Structure 1
């Protein structure tokens, strides 16, 4: 009646890879972000939610059209795409000239893990 346990090591690594693949192939995505140029980014709410509550506030305060969430003017693909990629990977890819805007954006979201990264000690 004793409970034993066996484990898979580095589960976070394993699980992470599966999610990135899903994001790439747009499998199991349950939120569509729409930008001013009508381009759209399909994401997993849950991935978003692990790093920030900001998107919870957006779905409560922004327009929903065609099942897609209209992004506010200061939150367009130039900052959202690299921030979302960061959410999936731990890695932020960016042009240096985007540093300030990304940092200000992370602060406005209170996305602590990202602003800590951008502030680099």
Structure 2
């Protein structure tokens, strides 16, 4: 018969490995480019777990030298904290950015982040 054995807390194991890959830019397959020409390299599948907005950007925005040109309303001030949230489950932000991050999560329909920003008690 079929047996099964398991490693507990697989999600924690896997996230640690994935975060390391992100930090070292290993296996990244999407390069985001900001107005100042700086870049952030990411994993498409990580972004896609939370949202389809990056899918729509890839369908509708210019690609220059293998980098996706981010829209004017979606620059590093919101992108960097949101991407770090997608890799970790933690959103780090200054309060002054709360409303901008909420409007950005609403534009993305990023439900999991909306729920977090709107959490209470």
State if a TM-score over 0.5 links the two structures.
yes
Cα distance in 2 for partners of 1:108, 1:26 equals: 27
Residues 7-58 of structure 1, C-alpha deviations (whole Å, 9 max, x = no match): 0000000000000000001111000000000000000000000000000000
Cα distance in 2 for partners of 1:6, 1:116 equals: 35
Residues 38-84 of structure 1, C-alpha deviations (whole Å, 9 max, x = no match): 00000000000000000000000000000000000000000000000
Cα distance in 2 for partners of 1:72, 1:87 equals: 19
Match of 2:60 in 1: 61
Match of 2:80 in 1: 81
Aligned residues: CA RMSD: 0.4
Shift of 1:120: 1.1
Gapped runs of 5+ residues in structure 2? Answer: none
Match of 2:103 in 1: 104
SS of the aligned residue for 2:5 comes to strand
Match of 1:70 in 2: 69
Matched length:
120
TM value normalised by structure 1: 0.98
Residues 65-106 of structure 1, C-alpha deviations (whole Å, 9 max, x = no match): 000000000000000000000000000000000000000000
SS of the aligned residue for 2:4 comes to strand
Structure 1 ranges of 4+ moved more than 6 A = none
TM value normalised by structure 2: 0.98
